[PDB]
Amino acid sequence: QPRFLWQGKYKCHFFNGTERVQFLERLFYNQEEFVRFDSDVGEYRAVTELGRPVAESWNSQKDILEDRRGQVDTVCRHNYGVGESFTVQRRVHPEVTVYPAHNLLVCSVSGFYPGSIEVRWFGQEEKAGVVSTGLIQNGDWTFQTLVMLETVPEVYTCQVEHPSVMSPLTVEWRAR
Amino acid sequence: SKMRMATPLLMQAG
């Protein structure tokens, strides 16, 4: 059976809190973006042919433009204050463990928030040959990452720095 | 406390 989809995306982009804020409205039909309101331009602009008379009608209305131009303050800046404490200011401790996976040493970092994290292998720290699976978003306000080490090979230590933990977390490893 | 939202615009007046 035929399907028809509408998508509305109202994005509030914050650059250093509520100092620099942009509001971006993008409308989609069957996945294709046709029209958009960028606060930096202050008017609606067409993306495809369908959005041409759409942007034409809205831009010709002073009341529509003033409403869309004020979104940065009435919605964007207001919502930043409402959610600040439980989103921007959310801090959850990482859970660090070390295990081997041929030689390749793994440092498992789990359940942390926010995503910003420093993971270093150490006596002297090694910077070359420390492959990572990358930052993985679990979809539940936690992150997980695995930071490997192409070693041959001594005690190996994984050092983790995060905004939640005050002192750097460390986990040592030795084989038997 | 109250989360706000952007309202969609109507394309036509019916």
Added chain:
Amino acid sequence: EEHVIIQAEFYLNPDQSGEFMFDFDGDEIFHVDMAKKETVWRLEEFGRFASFEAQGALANIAVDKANLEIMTKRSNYTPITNVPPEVTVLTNSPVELREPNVLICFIDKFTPPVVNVTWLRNGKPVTTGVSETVFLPREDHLFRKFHYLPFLPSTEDVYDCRVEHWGLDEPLLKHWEF
């Protein structure tokens, strides 16, 4: 770039299905259950610090339905080009024998936002303690979705996530073993 909040809403015909959610830096803050007229916080604690009137989201989706119906006419009833999902079965933490864990079925890069996801243990379907997210937004304007199965890892059990989509010629079944 410091923080991004996206209000993502959709309406789909002829299914007459709509969704409304808030996204903060790739994570869901809340969504509105259209059937229950209810604001559903991704973490329960969020509803203690903030509130959202679900009625506003339902009136937004009515406007989305009206605008979709106008846009469908203007395109001369042109339909969505279906994109099939790529699906992955994984755990949120390292798996330990007989240690409570959560299997996660990640259904990604698909459209329209309609799926039939089933969990099975040793073949038989399982609905015990299972949970799921709504249709979450992607930057390529396709959808992603998480399905969760709390489980006690064993060396004998076999798990599968079966996903049905219209872009798939055959229903996808991704296998998971300890």
